Amino acid sequence: GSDLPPPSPPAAATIVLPPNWKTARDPEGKIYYYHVITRQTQWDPPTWESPGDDAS
């Protein structure tokens, strides 16, 4: 990443997600996000902003 090297995911990661966050994808077609403030990452859990049904 530009700000931070990619993390392995924390359980805490879900708490809050900042617009500051960056994204990266693996060679094996997986795309994920990482939080520069908190040092967190999520590959599967949706962004801070999601539809109404997801209720983020």
From Swiss-Prot:
Transmembrane segments: none annotated. It is found in: Nucleus; Chromosome. Ubiquitously expressed. May be automethylated. It comes from the Eukaryota. Residues 15-48 form the WW domain. Specifically interacts with hyperphosphorylated C-terminal domain (CTD) of RNA polymerase II large subunit (POLR2A): binds to CTD heptad repeats doubly phosphorylated on 'Ser-2' and 'Ser-5' of each heptad. Interacts with HTT. Interacts with IWS1. Interacts with p53/TP53; leading to regulate p53/TP53 target genes. Component of a complex with HNRNPL. Interacts with TUBA1A; the interaction is independent on alpha-tubulin acetylation on 'Lys-40'. Interacts with STAT1. Histone methyltransferase that specifically trimethylates 'Lys-36' of histone H3 (H3K36me3) using dimethylated 'Lys-36' (H3K36me2) as substrate. It is capable of trimethylating unmethylated H3K36 (H3K36me0) in vitro. Represents the main enzyme generating H3K36me3, a specific tag for epigenetic transcriptional activation. Plays a role in chromatin structure modulation during elongation by coordinating recruitment of the FACT complex and by interacting with hyperphosphorylated POLR2A. Belongs to the class V-like SAM-binding methyltransferase superfamily. Histone-lysine methyltransferase family. SET2 subfamily. It is linked to Renal cell carcinoma: Renal cell carcinoma is a heterogeneous group of sporadic or hereditary carcinoma derived from cells of the proximal renal tubular epithelium. It is subclassified into clear cell renal carcinoma (non-papillary carcinoma), papillary renal cell carcinoma, chromophobe renal cell carcinoma, collecting duct carcinoma with medullary carcinoma of the kidney, and unclassified renal cell carcinoma. Clear cell renal cell carcinoma is the most common subtype. Luscan-Lumish syndrome: An autosomal dominant syndrome with a variable phenotype. Clinical features include macrocephaly, distinctive facial appearance, postnatal overgrowth, various degrees of learning difficulties, autism spectrum disorder, and intellectual disability. The low charge region mediates the transcriptional activation activity. This is Histone-lysine N-methyltransferase SETD2.
